């Protein structure tokens, strides 16, 4: 699809058997999801943005389905106010910026 930017580019994602609403975020290096459980090993990580840093759990090799496109990558889990799909997964679904 072609998604305009008059409003937040929110899409439905499927992660760890759950459906969530997430933002397609070209300004985010990483994908950050609100608190949930995911299987496998994790390690703590600190990520910083507007308003400072938050502590997250880093899970690697996690499959997500984004608008019907499946991708795999690292997912960070922690107190983000909005679920964010960052560049590490946007590349995998072939998402580009065009003007």
Ligand X SMILES: O=C1C(=O)N(C(c2ccccc2)c2ccccc2)[C@H]2CNC[C@@H]2N1C(c1ccccc1)c1ccccc1
Q: Which residue is nearest to ligand X (CB)?
A: 49
Q: Which residues pair with 48 in a beta bridge?
A: 53
Cα angle value 98/80/13 (rounded, 5°): 55
Please check whether residue 82 is in contact with residue 31, taking contact to mean a CB–CB distance below 8 angstroms: no
- Return the number of the residue (4 or 17) whose C-beta is nearest ligand X: 4
Q: Does the annotation mark 30 as catalytic?
A: no
Which 48-87 residues touch Cl ion, going by CB under 5 A?
73-74
Of 25, 33, 77, 89, which one interacts with ligand X (CB under 6 A)? 25
Q: Which is nearer to ligand X, 17 or 52 (CB)?
A: 52
Question: Interface residues for a copy of itself in 17-76 (CB under 8 A)?
Answer: 23-29, 32, 47-54, 67, 69
Residue 20's φ and ψ, nearest 5 degrees, are -140, 160
CB atoms within 10 A of CB 82: 13
Can you give the length of the chain in residues?
99
Catalytic amino acids? 25
Residues engaged in binding Cl ion (CB under 5 A): 4, 73-74, 88
């Amino acid at each position: 699809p072609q998604i305009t930017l008059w409003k937040r580019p929110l899409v439905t994602i499927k992660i760890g058997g759950q459906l969530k609403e997430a933002l397609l975020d070209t300004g985010a290096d990483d994908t950050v999801i609100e608190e949930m459980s995911l299987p496998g090993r994790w390690k703590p990580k600190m990520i910083g943005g507007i308003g400072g840093f938050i502590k997250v759990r880093q899970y690697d090799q996690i499959i997500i389905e984004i608008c019907g496109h499946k991708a795999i990558g690292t997912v960070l889990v922690g107190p983000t106010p909005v679920n964010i799909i960052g560049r590490n997964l946007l590349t995998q679904i072939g998402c580009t910026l065009n003007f």
